[PDB]
Amino acid sequence: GMARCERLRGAALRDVLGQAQGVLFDCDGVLWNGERIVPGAPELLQRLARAGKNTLFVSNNSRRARPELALRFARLGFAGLRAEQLFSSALCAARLLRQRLAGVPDPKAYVLGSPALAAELEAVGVTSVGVGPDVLHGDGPSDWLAVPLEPDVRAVVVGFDPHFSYMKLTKAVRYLQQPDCLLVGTNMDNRLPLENGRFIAGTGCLVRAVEMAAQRQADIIGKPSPYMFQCITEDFSVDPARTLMVGDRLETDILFGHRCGMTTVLTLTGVSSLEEAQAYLTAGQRDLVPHYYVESIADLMEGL
Amino acid sequence: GMARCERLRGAALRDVLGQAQGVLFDCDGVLWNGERIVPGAPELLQRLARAGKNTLFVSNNSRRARPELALRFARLGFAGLRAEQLFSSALCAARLLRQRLAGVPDPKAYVLGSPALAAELEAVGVTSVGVGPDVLHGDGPSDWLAVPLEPDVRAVVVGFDPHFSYMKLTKAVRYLQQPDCLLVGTNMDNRLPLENGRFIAGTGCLVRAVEMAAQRQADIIGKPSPYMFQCITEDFSVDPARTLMVGDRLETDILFGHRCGMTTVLTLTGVSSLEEAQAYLTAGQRDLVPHYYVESIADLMEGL
Ligand SMILES: [Mg+2]
Ligand SMILES: [Mg+2]
């Protein structure tokens, strides 16, 4: 219940991991950093599998699709992995629209995002527009507002989009003038972590901008939004009480666990540090303190 | 004292307006709506001048320089207007940087904004770069982050920029990696009002985007930011107790007045309606309740 931020070892470690029906893994900062993977991570999955434990993988990535993600696992030495275990914000975004755009014929979405995100939409029957560069044509507003749009658009989907422009912001706002139109954000992250400790602006910057202009609260898919779990529980029977959430980041992965009622395990490889976790415990922010923590997910094995 | 949202007529209209040493006007929705001016607005100004009252004009516009704004006034039938009375967010942005870069040699700023905003900076001694289109080329992040920047940049200034892109956002974040660098936002408005009641995304959307990515709280110039007043009091001696703030919007102009200690007057020829004012008074949110209100600023003449 109350995260004591205890290091998960020996007696407690065998208990909690042992009792777990399944384990939920963030990918970046947990299983790997770039193409260089965390020691013993592949073996951990093998043993989790043989222990009879369901392992699922969750990612706020919105740039590259399920197929190319499964391959990434293979490239990095993770084998025997089914695509059905992979859940990205783009996938779950598509899943949301399909449910919302139920009895709507020829469902269309304006997409400020990647070709992958489009693919995930196209896999659920939702056609896409907006992917790619949209440079600003015209002298002033009257020109920008006269650009012909898609009449069948029933949703604005903001994912990660390096081609995000004021022009796209305008189109999205225009589309959203129809109240019935949906606004979806793949994730609210302010930063996208990069391989060697670098970063660039995160999708949440683009989402928040559209929200402000359109004066709307977007539906967010990715962690720490509980819908990520919703997306999972539709496919898998996941008793959160018997499932561990493992992540490197406190503001995404851990908060996700608490909101879903999962026992959370912070790994000290990746973004967050223990000092920060205790600082939250230390600061009274009851929802960002991990129940347990480990130096690396490799430490989890003796629990099996 | 406590703004009761009273209708300003006869005795009350005679009292405070009579006692007022000066009057501060927002332009859009007060003096005019688009190119259509409020009947008798020019007359009010003529009569205020002869009454011996200093009139100043404040705007969150960042697309028009002081000169080009003065012309708008003259061409729209407002005569005897000195440019010294005009205060735009772009102008005050320049005033801020000049003060903050008080002793920096060859000061440079990265500007996500208009050529005008650049001019106000260039008139104040601050060199500018970033104005105009900045298309994103390169396959991924490593390419985007390897783009050579201008070394002398000591400030990021976010104004209204229809060329705003993820590349510009990226450049801004990189500049801001040096903590000593400044982050300035001309205004935080969610929307930019257009001639015929239309609108487009406001500067505040872009600013918030840069803030999130760079994890910075930008310094805001325009209303309702008190700095707009500071910018003015550097030029004019304004006793706020003897100065009227007149505006069409409650959340920008009126909030601005309360924060500066000016007697606030809502004109109903603009964005806000009387209904909204009564809602705030009813709700106890004192900083958005106008002390007084008039159907049009033309009603103020009988106070003289
Ligand atoms: Mg991660
Ligand atoms: Mg206005």
Coordinates of C-alpha atoms and ligand atoms in Angstrom, one line a residue:
Chain A
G1 CA 0.0 0.0 0.0
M2 CA 2.3 2.7 1.3
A3 CA 5.6 2.7 -0.7
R4 CA 8.4 2.5 1.8
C5 CA 11.0 2.6 -1.0
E6 CA 12.7 -0.5 0.3
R7 CA 15.5 -2.2 -1.6
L8 CA 14.0 -5.5 -2.8
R9 CA 16.3 -8.3 -1.7
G10 CA 16.3 -11.8 -0.2
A11 CA 13.2 -12.7 1.9
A12 CA 11.0 -9.9 0.6
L13 CA 12.3 -10.4 -2.9
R14 CA 11.3 -14.0 -3.2
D15 CA 8.0 -13.3 -1.6
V16 CA 6.8 -10.4 -3.8
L17 CA 8.3 -11.7 -7.1
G18 CA 7.3 -15.2 -6.2
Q19 CA 3.7 -14.2 -5.7
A20 CA 3.5 -12.1 -8.8
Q21 CA 1.3 -13.5 -11.6
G22 CA 3.0 -11.2 -14.1
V23 CA 5.5 -8.4 -14.6
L24 CA 5.1 -5.1 -16.5
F25 CA 8.2 -3.6 -18.1
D26 CA 9.1 -0.2 -19.4
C27 CA 11.6 -0.7 -22.3
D28 CA 13.9 2.3 -22.3
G29 CA 16.1 2.5 -19.2
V30 CA 15.0 -0.9 -18.0
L31 CA 15.8 -3.6 -20.6
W32 CA 18.3 -1.4 -22.5
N33 CA 19.9 1.9 -23.1
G34 CA 20.2 2.4 -26.9
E35 CA 21.4 -0.8 -28.6
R36 CA 23.5 -1.6 -25.5
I37 CA 21.4 -3.7 -23.1
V38 CA 21.2 -4.1 -19.3
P39 CA 23.3 -7.2 -18.2
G40 CA 21.1 -10.2 -17.5
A41 CA 17.9 -8.7 -18.7
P42 CA 17.3 -11.3 -21.4
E43 CA 17.9 -14.1 -18.9
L44 CA 15.5 -12.5 -16.5
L45 CA 12.7 -12.8 -19.0
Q46 CA 13.6 -16.4 -19.8
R47 CA 13.3 -17.2 -16.1
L48 CA 10.1 -15.2 -15.7
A49 CA 8.6 -17.2 -18.6
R50 CA 9.7 -20.5 -17.1
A51 CA 8.5 -19.5 -13.7
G52 CA 5.1 -19.3 -15.4
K53 CA 4.8 -15.5 -15.1
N54 CA 3.3 -13.4 -17.8
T55 CA 5.6 -10.6 -18.9
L56 CA 4.3 -7.6 -20.8
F57 CA 6.1 -4.5 -22.1
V58 CA 4.8 -1.0 -22.1
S59 CA 6.3 2.0 -24.0
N60 CA 5.3 5.6 -24.6
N61 CA 7.1 5.4 -27.9
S62 CA 4.9 6.7 -30.7
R63 CA 7.4 6.8 -33.5
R64 CA 8.0 3.1 -34.4
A65 CA 5.5 0.3 -34.7
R66 CA 4.8 -3.1 -33.1
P67 CA 6.6 -5.1 -35.9
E68 CA 9.7 -3.0 -35.8
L69 CA 9.7 -3.1 -32.0
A70 CA 9.5 -6.9 -31.9
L71 CA 12.5 -6.9 -34.2
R72 CA 14.3 -4.5 -31.9
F73 CA 13.9 -7.1 -29.1
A74 CA 15.4 -9.8 -31.4
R75 CA 18.2 -7.5 -32.4
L76 CA 19.1 -7.0 -28.8
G77 CA 19.0 -10.7 -27.8
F78 CA 15.5 -11.0 -26.6
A79 CA 14.0 -14.2 -28.1
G80 CA 10.7 -16.1 -27.8
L81 CA 8.9 -12.8 -27.6
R82 CA 5.4 -12.5 -29.0
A83 CA 4.2 -9.2 -30.5
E84 CA 1.0 -9.6 -28.4
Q85 CA 3.1 -8.7 -25.3
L86 CA 4.0 -5.3 -26.8
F87 CA 2.0 -2.1 -25.9
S88 CA 3.0 1.3 -27.3
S89 CA 1.1 4.6 -26.9
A90 CA 0.5 4.5 -30.7
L91 CA -1.0 1.0 -30.5
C92 CA -3.2 1.9 -27.6
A93 CA -4.1 5.2 -29.3
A94 CA -5.4 3.3 -32.3
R95 CA -7.3 1.0 -29.9
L96 CA -9.0 4.0 -28.2
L97 CA -10.2 5.5 -31.5
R98 CA -11.6 2.2 -32.8
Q99 CA -13.7 1.9 -29.6
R100 CA -14.7 5.6 -29.7
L101 CA -15.3 5.6 -33.5
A102 CA -17.4 2.4 -33.2
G103 CA -20.4 2.8 -35.5
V104 CA -18.7 5.5 -37.6
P105 CA -18.1 4.7 -41.3
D106 CA -14.8 5.6 -42.9
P107 CA -13.4 6.9 -39.7
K108 CA -10.7 9.5 -40.3
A109 CA -8.1 11.1 -38.0
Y110 CA -5.8 14.1 -38.4
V111 CA -2.4 12.9 -37.1
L112 CA 0.4 15.1 -35.9
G113 CA 2.8 12.1 -35.6
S114 CA 4.8 9.4 -37.2
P115 CA 4.1 6.9 -40.0
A116 CA 4.0 4.2 -37.4
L117 CA 1.2 5.9 -35.4
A118 CA -0.6 6.1 -38.8
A119 CA 0.0 2.4 -39.3
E120 CA -1.4 1.5 -35.9
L121 CA -4.5 3.6 -36.9
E122 CA -4.7 2.0 -40.3
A123 CA -4.5 -1.5 -38.7
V124 CA -7.7 -0.7 -36.7
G125 CA -9.5 0.7 -39.8
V126 CA -8.9 4.4 -39.1
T127 CA -7.5 6.2 -42.1
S128 CA -4.9 9.0 -41.4
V129 CA -3.8 12.4 -42.7
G130 CA -1.3 14.9 -41.5
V131 CA 1.8 12.8 -41.2
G132 CA 4.8 14.4 -42.7
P133 CA 5.9 18.1 -43.1
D134 CA 3.3 20.8 -43.2
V135 CA 5.2 24.0 -43.9
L136 CA 3.3 27.3 -43.6
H137 CA 1.9 28.6 -46.9
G138 CA 0.3 32.1 -47.1
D139 CA 1.0 35.6 -46.0
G140 CA -1.3 35.8 -43.0
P141 CA -4.2 34.2 -41.1
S142 CA -6.8 34.6 -43.9
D143 CA -4.6 32.4 -46.1
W144 CA -3.9 29.8 -43.3
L145 CA -7.6 29.5 -42.5
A146 CA -8.6 29.0 -46.1
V147 CA -6.6 25.8 -46.6
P148 CA -9.1 23.0 -47.4
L149 CA -9.3 20.2 -44.8
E150 CA -10.7 16.7 -44.6
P151 CA -14.4 16.6 -44.0
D152 CA -14.5 13.1 -42.5
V153 CA -11.9 13.9 -39.8
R154 CA -13.3 12.6 -36.5
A155 CA -10.2 12.9 -34.4
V156 CA -7.0 14.9 -33.8
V157 CA -4.2 12.6 -32.7
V158 CA -1.0 14.2 -31.4
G159 CA 1.9 11.9 -31.2
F160 CA 5.6 12.7 -31.4
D161 CA 6.0 14.8 -34.5
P162 CA 9.3 16.5 -35.5
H163 CA 7.3 18.1 -38.3
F164 CA 5.1 19.9 -35.8
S165 CA 4.4 23.4 -37.1
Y166 CA 2.2 26.4 -36.5
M167 CA 0.4 25.2 -39.6
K168 CA -0.4 21.8 -38.1
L169 CA -1.4 23.5 -34.9
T170 CA -3.8 25.6 -36.9
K171 CA -5.4 22.7 -38.8
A172 CA -5.8 20.8 -35.5
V173 CA -7.5 23.8 -33.9
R174 CA -9.8 24.1 -37.0
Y175 CA -10.7 20.4 -36.9
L176 CA -11.4 20.8 -33.2
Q177 CA -13.9 23.5 -33.8
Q178 CA -16.4 20.7 -34.2
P179 CA -17.1 19.7 -30.6
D180 CA -17.8 16.1 -31.5
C181 CA -14.2 15.8 -32.8
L182 CA -11.8 13.9 -30.6
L183 CA -8.4 15.0 -29.3
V184 CA -6.0 12.3 -28.4
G185 CA -2.4 12.7 -27.0
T186 CA -0.1 9.7 -27.2
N187 CA 1.7 10.8 -24.1
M188 CA 2.4 14.0 -22.0
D189 CA 6.1 13.7 -21.7
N190 CA 8.0 17.0 -21.7
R191 CA 11.2 15.4 -23.0
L192 CA 12.1 12.5 -25.2
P193 CA 15.2 10.8 -23.7
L194 CA 18.0 10.0 -26.2
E195 CA 20.6 7.3 -26.2
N196 CA 23.7 9.0 -24.6
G197 CA 21.9 11.1 -21.9
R198 CA 20.7 13.7 -24.4
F199 CA 17.1 14.7 -24.9
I200 CA 14.8 16.6 -27.2
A201 CA 11.3 18.1 -26.7
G202 CA 8.7 15.6 -25.7
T203 CA 5.3 14.9 -27.2
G204 CA 3.6 16.6 -24.3
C205 CA 4.9 20.0 -25.5
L206 CA 3.0 19.5 -28.8
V207 CA -0.1 18.2 -27.1
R208 CA -0.3 21.0 -24.5
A209 CA 0.0 23.6 -27.3
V210 CA -3.0 22.1 -29.2
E211 CA -4.9 21.8 -25.9
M212 CA -4.3 25.5 -25.1
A213 CA -5.3 26.7 -28.6
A214 CA -8.3 24.4 -28.8
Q215 CA -9.0 24.9 -25.1
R216 CA -9.5 21.2 -24.6
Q217 CA -8.4 18.5 -22.2
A218 CA -6.9 15.8 -24.5
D219 CA -7.3 12.1 -23.8
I220 CA -3.8 10.8 -23.0
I221 CA -2.8 7.2 -23.8
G222 CA 0.7 6.6 -22.6
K223 CA 2.0 6.3 -19.1
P224 CA 1.3 7.5 -16.5
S225 CA -2.2 7.6 -18.0
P226 CA -4.2 4.7 -16.7
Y227 CA -5.6 4.0 -20.2
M228 CA -2.3 2.3 -21.0
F229 CA -3.5 -0.3 -18.4
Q230 CA -7.0 -0.2 -20.0
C231 CA -5.4 -1.0 -23.3
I232 CA -3.6 -4.0 -21.7
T233 CA -6.5 -5.4 -19.7
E234 CA -8.6 -5.6 -22.8
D235 CA -6.2 -8.2 -24.2
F236 CA -4.8 -9.7 -21.0
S237 CA -6.4 -10.6 -17.6
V238 CA -4.1 -8.6 -15.3
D239 CA -4.9 -8.6 -11.6
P240 CA -3.0 -5.4 -10.6
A241 CA -2.7 -6.8 -7.1
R242 CA -0.6 -9.7 -8.4
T243 CA 1.4 -7.8 -11.0
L244 CA 4.6 -5.8 -10.7
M245 CA 5.2 -2.5 -12.6
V246 CA 8.9 -2.0 -13.3
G247 CA 10.3 1.2 -14.7
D248 CA 13.3 3.6 -14.6
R249 CA 11.3 6.8 -14.5
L250 CA 9.4 8.0 -11.4
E251 CA 7.1 10.6 -13.2
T252 CA 5.9 8.1 -15.8
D253 CA 6.4 4.5 -14.7
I254 CA 5.9 4.7 -10.9
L255 CA 3.0 7.1 -11.1
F256 CA 1.6 4.6 -13.6
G257 CA 1.8 1.8 -11.1
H258 CA 0.2 3.7 -8.3
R259 CA -2.7 4.8 -10.4
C260 CA -3.3 1.2 -11.6
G261 CA -2.9 -0.3 -8.1
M262 CA 0.2 -2.3 -9.1
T263 CA 3.2 -2.8 -6.8
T264 CA 5.9 -0.7 -8.3
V265 CA 9.6 -1.5 -8.6
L266 CA 12.0 1.3 -9.5
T267 CA 15.2 0.1 -11.2
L268 CA 18.2 2.4 -10.6
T269 CA 19.4 2.0 -14.2
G270 CA 18.0 4.7 -16.4
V271 CA 16.5 8.1 -15.7
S272 CA 15.6 8.3 -12.0
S273 CA 18.0 8.1 -9.0
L274 CA 17.2 6.9 -5.4
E275 CA 17.8 10.3 -3.9
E276 CA 15.0 11.7 -5.9
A277 CA 12.6 8.8 -4.9
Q278 CA 13.4 9.3 -1.2
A279 CA 13.0 13.0 -1.8
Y280 CA 9.4 12.4 -2.8
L281 CA 8.9 10.2 0.3
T282 CA 10.9 12.8 2.0
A283 CA 8.7 15.5 0.5
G284 CA 5.2 14.0 1.1
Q285 CA 4.5 13.2 -2.5
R286 CA 2.9 9.9 -1.7
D287 CA 2.2 8.9 -5.3
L288 CA 5.7 8.9 -6.8
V289 CA 7.5 6.8 -4.2
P290 CA 8.3 3.3 -5.5
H291 CA 7.2 0.4 -3.2
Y292 CA 10.6 -1.2 -3.8
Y293 CA 13.7 -0.5 -5.8
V294 CA 16.6 -2.5 -7.3
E295 CA 20.0 -1.5 -8.7
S296 CA 19.1 -3.4 -11.9
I297 CA 16.3 -5.7 -13.0
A298 CA 19.0 -8.4 -13.0
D299 CA 18.6 -8.4 -9.2
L300 CA 15.1 -9.7 -9.5
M301 CA 16.2 -13.2 -10.5
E302 CA 16.8 -14.7 -7.1
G303 CA 13.2 -14.0 -6.3
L304 CA 12.5 -16.9 -8.7
Chain B
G1 CA -12.0 49.5 -3.1
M2 CA -13.4 46.0 -3.6
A3 CA -14.6 45.9 -7.2
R4 CA -18.4 45.5 -7.2
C5 CA -18.8 45.6 -11.0
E6 CA -20.8 48.8 -10.7
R7 CA -22.1 50.5 -13.8
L8 CA -20.2 53.8 -14.3
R9 CA -22.6 56.6 -14.8
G10 CA -23.3 60.2 -13.5
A11 CA -21.9 60.7 -10.0
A12 CA -19.5 57.7 -10.0
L13 CA -18.5 58.4 -13.6
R14 CA -17.8 62.0 -12.6
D15 CA -15.9 61.1 -9.5
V16 CA -13.1 58.6 -10.4
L17 CA -12.8 59.7 -14.1
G18 CA -12.7 63.3 -12.9
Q19 CA -10.0 62.5 -10.3
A20 CA -8.1 60.2 -12.7
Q21 CA -4.7 61.6 -13.6
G22 CA -4.4 59.2 -16.6
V23 CA -6.1 56.4 -18.5
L24 CA -4.7 53.2 -19.8
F25 CA -6.4 51.6 -22.8
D26 CA -6.2 48.1 -24.4
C27 CA -6.6 48.6 -28.1
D28 CA -8.5 45.6 -29.5
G29 CA -12.1 45.4 -28.4
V30 CA -12.0 48.8 -26.8
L31 CA -11.0 51.4 -29.5
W32 CA -12.0 49.1 -32.3
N33 CA -13.0 45.5 -33.3
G34 CA -10.9 44.7 -36.3
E35 CA -10.9 47.7 -38.7
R36 CA -14.3 48.9 -37.4
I37 CA -13.7 51.4 -34.6
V38 CA -16.0 52.1 -31.6
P39 CA -18.2 55.1 -32.3
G40 CA -16.9 58.2 -30.5
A41 CA -13.7 56.5 -29.4
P42 CA -11.6 59.2 -31.2
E43 CA -13.7 61.9 -29.5
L44 CA -13.1 60.3 -26.1
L45 CA -9.4 60.6 -26.6
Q46 CA -9.6 64.2 -27.9
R47 CA -11.6 65.1 -24.8
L48 CA -9.3 63.2 -22.4
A49 CA -6.3 65.1 -23.8
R50 CA -8.0 68.5 -23.3
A51 CA -9.1 67.3 -19.9
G52 CA -5.4 67.2 -19.1
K53 CA -5.3 63.4 -18.6
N54 CA -2.5 61.3 -19.8
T55 CA -3.7 58.5 -22.1
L56 CA -1.5 55.4 -22.8
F57 CA -2.2 52.4 -24.9
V58 CA -1.1 48.8 -24.1
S59 CA -1.2 45.8 -26.5
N60 CA -0.1 42.2 -26.4
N61 CA 0.4 42.4 -30.2
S62 CA 3.9 41.3 -31.2
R63 CA 3.5 41.6 -35.0
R64 CA 3.5 45.4 -35.3
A65 CA 6.3 47.8 -34.4
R66 CA 5.7 51.1 -32.6
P67 CA 5.8 53.0 -35.9
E68 CA 3.4 50.7 -37.8
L69 CA 1.0 50.8 -34.8
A70 CA 1.0 54.6 -34.8
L71 CA 0.0 54.6 -38.5
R72 CA -2.9 52.2 -37.7
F73 CA -4.1 54.8 -35.1
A74 CA -3.8 57.7 -37.6
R75 CA -5.3 55.8 -40.5
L76 CA -8.2 54.7 -38.4
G77 CA -9.1 58.3 -37.4
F78 CA -7.0 58.7 -34.2
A79 CA -5.0 61.9 -34.5
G80 CA -2.6 63.8 -32.3
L81 CA -1.1 60.5 -31.2
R82 CA 2.5 60.3 -30.1
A83 CA 4.3 57.0 -30.6
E84 CA 5.6 57.4 -27.0
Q85 CA 2.1 56.5 -25.8
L86 CA 2.2 53.1 -27.5
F87 CA 3.3 50.0 -25.6
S88 CA 3.4 46.6 -27.2
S89 CA 4.6 43.3 -25.7
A90 CA 7.3 43.3 -28.3
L91 CA 8.5 46.8 -27.2
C92 CA 8.6 45.9 -23.6
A93 CA 10.3 42.6 -24.4
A94 CA 13.1 44.7 -25.8
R95 CA 13.1 46.9 -22.8
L96 CA 13.4 43.9 -20.5
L97 CA 16.3 42.4 -22.4
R98 CA 18.1 45.7 -22.5
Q99 CA 17.8 45.9 -18.7
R100 CA 18.8 42.2 -18.1
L101 CA 21.6 42.3 -20.7
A102 CA 22.6 45.6 -19.1
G103 CA 26.3 45.1 -19.6
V104 CA 26.7 42.3 -22.1
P105 CA 28.8 43.1 -25.2
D106 CA 27.2 42.3 -28.6
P107 CA 24.1 40.9 -27.0
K108 CA 22.2 38.4 -29.2
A109 CA 18.8 36.8 -28.9
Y110 CA 17.2 33.8 -30.6
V111 CA 13.8 35.0 -31.6
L112 CA 10.8 32.8 -32.3
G113 CA 8.7 35.7 -33.5
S114 CA 8.0 38.4 -35.9
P115 CA 10.4 40.7 -37.9
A116 CA 8.9 43.5 -35.8
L117 CA 9.8 41.8 -32.5
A118 CA 13.3 41.6 -33.9
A119 CA 13.2 45.3 -34.8
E120 CA 12.3 46.3 -31.3
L121 CA 15.3 44.3 -30.1
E122 CA 17.5 45.6 -32.8
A123 CA 16.5 49.2 -31.9
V124 CA 17.5 48.4 -28.3
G125 CA 20.9 47.0 -29.3
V126 CA 20.0 43.3 -29.2
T127 CA 20.9 41.4 -32.3
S128 CA 18.4 38.7 -33.5
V129 CA 18.3 35.4 -35.3
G130 CA 15.7 32.7 -35.8
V131 CA 13.0 34.8 -37.4
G132 CA 11.5 33.2 -40.5
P133 CA 11.0 29.6 -41.6
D134 CA 13.2 26.9 -40.0
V135 CA 12.4 23.6 -41.9
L136 CA 13.4 20.4 -40.3
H137 CA 15.9 18.4 -42.3
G138 CA 17.9 15.3 -41.3
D139 CA 16.7 11.8 -40.6
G140 CA 16.7 11.8 -36.8
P141 CA 17.8 13.6 -33.5
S142 CA 21.6 13.2 -34.1
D143 CA 21.2 15.4 -37.2
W144 CA 18.9 17.9 -35.5
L145 CA 21.3 18.3 -32.6
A146 CA 24.4 18.7 -34.8
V147 CA 23.1 21.9 -36.4
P148 CA 25.6 24.7 -35.7
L149 CA 24.0 27.6 -33.7
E150 CA 24.9 31.2 -33.1
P151 CA 27.4 31.4 -30.2
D152 CA 26.7 34.8 -28.8
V153 CA 23.0 34.1 -28.1
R154 CA 22.1 35.1 -24.5
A155 CA 18.3 35.0 -24.7
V156 CA 15.4 33.0 -26.2
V157 CA 12.5 35.2 -27.0
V158 CA 9.2 33.5 -27.8
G159 CA 6.7 35.9 -29.5
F160 CA 4.0 35.1 -32.1
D161 CA 5.6 33.0 -34.7
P162 CA 3.7 31.4 -37.6
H163 CA 6.9 29.7 -38.5
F164 CA 7.1 27.9 -35.2
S165 CA 8.4 24.4 -35.7
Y166 CA 9.9 21.4 -33.8
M167 CA 13.3 22.5 -35.2
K168 CA 12.9 26.0 -33.7
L169 CA 11.7 24.4 -30.4
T170 CA 14.8 22.3 -30.5
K171 CA 17.2 25.2 -31.1
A172 CA 15.5 27.1 -28.2
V173 CA 16.0 24.2 -25.8
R174 CA 19.7 23.9 -26.7
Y175 CA 20.2 27.6 -26.1
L176 CA 18.5 27.2 -22.8
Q177 CA 20.8 24.4 -21.7
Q178 CA 23.0 27.2 -20.6
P179 CA 21.2 28.4 -17.4
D180 CA 22.5 31.9 -17.8
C181 CA 20.5 32.2 -21.0
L182 CA 17.2 34.1 -20.7
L183 CA 13.7 32.9 -21.6
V184 CA 11.2 35.6 -22.5
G185 CA 7.6 35.2 -23.6
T186 CA 5.9 38.3 -25.1
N187 CA 2.5 37.1 -23.9
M188 CA 0.7 34.0 -22.7
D189 CA -2.6 34.3 -24.6
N190 CA -4.1 31.0 -25.7
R191 CA -5.6 32.5 -28.9
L192 CA -4.9 35.4 -31.3
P193 CA -8.1 37.3 -32.1
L194 CA -8.6 38.0 -35.8
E195 CA -10.5 40.7 -37.7
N196 CA -14.0 39.2 -38.0
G197 CA -14.3 37.3 -34.7
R198 CA -12.1 34.4 -35.9
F199 CA -8.9 33.3 -34.1
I200 CA -5.8 31.2 -34.3
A201 CA -3.3 29.7 -31.8
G202 CA -1.9 32.2 -29.4
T203 CA 1.7 33.0 -28.5
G204 CA 1.2 31.4 -25.0
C205 CA 0.9 28.0 -26.7
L206 CA 4.4 28.3 -28.1
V207 CA 5.8 29.7 -24.9
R208 CA 4.4 26.8 -22.8
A209 CA 5.9 24.4 -25.3
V210 CA 9.4 25.9 -24.9
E211 CA 8.8 26.1 -21.1
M212 CA 8.0 22.4 -20.9
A213 CA 10.9 21.2 -23.1
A214 CA 13.4 23.5 -21.5
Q215 CA 11.8 23.0 -18.1
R216 CA 11.9 26.8 -17.5
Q217 CA 9.4 29.4 -16.3
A218 CA 9.6 32.1 -18.9
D219 CA 9.5 35.7 -18.1
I220 CA 6.2 37.1 -19.5
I221 CA 5.9 40.7 -20.7
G222 CA 2.3 41.2 -21.9
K223 CA -0.9 41.5 -19.9
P224 CA -1.9 40.3 -17.4
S225 CA 1.8 40.3 -16.5
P226 CA 2.7 43.2 -14.2
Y227 CA 5.9 43.8 -16.2
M228 CA 3.8 45.6 -18.8
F229 CA 3.3 48.3 -16.2
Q230 CA 6.9 48.3 -15.1
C231 CA 7.7 48.8 -18.8
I232 CA 5.4 51.8 -18.8
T233 CA 6.5 53.4 -15.5
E234 CA 10.0 53.6 -16.8
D235 CA 8.7 56.1 -19.3
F236 CA 5.8 57.7 -17.5
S237 CA 5.1 58.6 -13.8
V238 CA 1.9 56.6 -13.3
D239 CA 0.1 56.7 -9.9
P240 CA -2.0 53.5 -10.3
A241 CA -4.5 54.8 -7.7
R242 CA -5.1 57.7 -10.0
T243 CA -5.0 55.7 -13.3
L244 CA -7.8 53.8 -15.0
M245 CA -7.2 50.5 -16.8
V246 CA -9.8 50.0 -19.5
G247 CA -10.1 46.7 -21.3
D248 CA -12.4 44.3 -23.1
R249 CA -11.1 41.1 -21.5
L250 CA -11.4 40.1 -17.9
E251 CA -8.6 37.6 -17.8
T252 CA -6.0 39.9 -19.4
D253 CA -6.9 43.6 -19.0
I254 CA -8.9 43.5 -15.8
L255 CA -6.6 41.0 -14.0
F256 CA -3.8 43.3 -15.2
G257 CA -5.4 46.3 -13.6
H258 CA -5.9 44.6 -10.2
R259 CA -2.4 43.4 -10.1
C260 CA -1.1 46.9 -10.7
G261 CA -3.6 48.6 -8.3
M262 CA -5.4 50.5 -11.0
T263 CA -9.1 51.2 -11.0
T264 CA -10.5 48.8 -13.7
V265 CA -13.2 49.5 -16.2
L266 CA -14.6 46.8 -18.4
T267 CA -16.0 47.9 -21.8
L268 CA -18.7 45.6 -23.2
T269 CA -17.8 46.2 -26.8
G270 CA -15.2 43.4 -26.8
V271 CA -14.5 39.8 -25.8
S272 CA -16.0 39.6 -22.3
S273 CA -19.7 40.0 -21.5
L274 CA -21.3 41.4 -18.4
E275 CA -22.6 37.9 -17.5
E276 CA -19.0 36.6 -17.0
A277 CA -18.2 39.5 -14.7
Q278 CA -21.1 38.8 -12.4
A279 CA -20.1 35.2 -12.4
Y280 CA -16.7 36.0 -11.0
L281 CA -18.1 38.4 -8.4
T282 CA -20.6 35.7 -7.5
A283 CA -17.7 33.3 -7.2
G284 CA -15.6 35.5 -5.0
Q285 CA -12.7 35.6 -7.5
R286 CA -11.8 39.2 -6.8
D287 CA -9.0 39.7 -9.3
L288 CA -11.2 39.3 -12.3
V289 CA -14.1 41.5 -11.1
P290 CA -14.1 44.9 -12.7
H291 CA -14.5 47.9 -10.4
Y292 CA -16.7 49.5 -13.0
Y293 CA -18.1 48.7 -16.4
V294 CA -19.5 50.6 -19.4
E295 CA -21.3 49.5 -22.6
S296 CA -18.8 51.5 -24.6
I297 CA -15.9 53.8 -23.8
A298 CA -18.0 56.5 -25.4
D299 CA -20.0 56.4 -22.2
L300 CA -16.9 57.9 -20.4
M301 CA -17.2 61.3 -22.0
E302 CA -20.1 62.5 -19.7
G303 CA -17.6 62.1 -16.9
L304 CA -15.7 65.0 -18.3
Ligands
MG1 MG 11.6 4.5 -20.2
MG2 MG -7.8 43.4 -26.6

